[model samples]
Target: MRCIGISNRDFVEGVSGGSWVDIVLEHGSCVTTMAKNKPTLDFELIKTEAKQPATLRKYCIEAKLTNTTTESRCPTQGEPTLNEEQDKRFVCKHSMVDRGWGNGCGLFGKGGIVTCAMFTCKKNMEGKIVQPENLEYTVVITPHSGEEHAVGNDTGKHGKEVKITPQSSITEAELTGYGTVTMECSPRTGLDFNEMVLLQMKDKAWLVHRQWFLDLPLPWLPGADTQGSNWIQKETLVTFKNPHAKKQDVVVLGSQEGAMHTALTGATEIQMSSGNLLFTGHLKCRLRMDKLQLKGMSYSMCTGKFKVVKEIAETQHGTIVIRVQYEGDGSPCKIPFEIMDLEKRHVLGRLITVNPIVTEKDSPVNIEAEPPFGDSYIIIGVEPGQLKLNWFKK
Candidate 1:
């Protein structure tokens, strides 16, 4: 039997995603004065714990104005708003993790903190000013793992070659294994909020790049079937009186499921042979404007806590349409928009249906003519009224 030795670097690299540092400025002369040149910020990491498979890390950093000298005075005019100049800003922190995939496999399982400091400057008429030195704020980073690690092989295993078969397949693989190396440390606290903030920032960025769907109007067929009495058995044709010329032919499927119900939980669960069955359609309306607003009735898990999951806005148009699409359960539903005094707001007309239609059999649906909706309704700014409809038959 041969003994195989593994280095810490190999294990760390295999389990960790590497380390990264991020700086968020709270307030500084550069940020306050709206100066084109920003202050210089630096950071240094302090190794608090350095045990194999058990490394704990901490950090300290300083941020200061790089350009000002004796001539600099806290300008009364160009200074940060009241209290803003004096507010402490920026957090510096460190993280440690085990090198592994998924949850707690890493050292600090998906948790870290931002220990920060504050600085302020004051000026007097005597051409002299007082500048406070760097101030410090301490925060701890806690680790959270969704799963537990698997048991390690005991037997004081040296460099022993062993062949094992994966549960997925009978195929066997051989590897030189060693004894279990375990490391444990005290659990840190008070770092979840910053982690949440970072997570939200990341999610917002992703949403901007992810593809979304909208619903368009359904074309009017004079003899379309509308016989069933059940709410989910009726088929309704909603015509867009004013449709974009570019998107002249567009259609949307309607059901009685109510915008709030459909937008949240998706179509009804049970099958319905008549009335409008639950249906969904993809909408492509490319109207570029300054704002995007989506509105729909909301039912929250909490007695009085309806969560607004969707918001639409652009630097250009004030607001077009707002829709609420999902709830706490990660389910989809639609809530209607209530426009107050459309004429006063220069409100463009809206194309909405009283009830969403349900369908038993899946069919290709289309709408004709670009409806007369507000110019703010466009998203892609290219396709004005095209819509795609699909449904789960099961």
Candidate 2:
């Protein structure tokens, strides 16, 4: 007690051994009695990666019951009869070889149940149903569809009518109609013949009779000029339900208001255009007429056809190849000219029916910077007016 003096007990109560035992240091602070319990709670640097991590399933541990003890429920399965219908219709449409499950892929199991392990309710996956068995037949009539295109001396002289009187034998069919009707033996149901008289008709019966005589039974022989000699004429009827009106019909490309879509069929009369017409590439146009038959019936019709694209040395990145054809027509007919792009019905350009003189030069024929002036065919003309016989000299 005599060796010690208390100088710090006034400011800090019960802070003993102030004078003699206290050795003060002026530079820094010091701690004498360590706090018995200091918390050491913190996480250590286990890993630090900037990528999609590989495997970190080891970080889990037996944690205590500090949080909620509940979980959300999942869906299970669907009905029996409806689910079976889905399985039948699901048709494994993955026919395209490249990849993945089918277009509308659906997996199935026993009793029309979902095969997944999840306990929640599941919806039935419905798919598209395809029926190839219900196929409709098509008959294409062209100028060269065999003996069907019979042009007799007295064709189109009489009124239009289809007389299909049933007869025997699979060898030949007798045809007596306005347009010459010939038949090639085409059996749809196989070797066994059925007397199924099918008809598809509307306007131009001439085309149907002359070009294509399908599975129709004939009453009499084919008309004079266009002959159906030995081949058995099967009775096939062709009548028009109507000209099929497509959903999005006309298609115009490049314009802000361009229209959309289409298919077709027809025959082309042969033509030879060598000169006065730089004709190459197929052309398309139509003609319509309402004719009164000799029997006093009206025939309202329109005919369509494609012109052969002959020697079409087309425009850049161009495409077109055609040839000439001629029978005994007086005026030299320049084969039509045409160009079509993917989006449009017809591409815009000059349909040149050139009586052209392309000299066979050794070096190169002078490519014109601009097309030279020639005959004015009120065609799709450039910057020109149509009041022709008045304005310009004839």
Best candidate, lDDT: 1
lDDT of 1 by residue, 244-297 (tens): 211111122333223322432432121123322121111111111112112122
* Candidate lDDT (C-alpha), each: 0.18, 0.17
For candidate 2, write residues 41-96 as lDDT tens digits.
00011111111211101110111111111111111223222232233111111011
Give TM per candidate.
0.12, 0.13
| Best TM-score among the predictions, by candidate number | 2
Per-residue lDDT of 72 in model 1: 12
Instruction: Tell me the lDDT of model 1 at 145.
Output: 9
lDDT over C-alpha atoms for residue 366 of model 1:
13
Global CA lDDT computed for model 2: 0.17
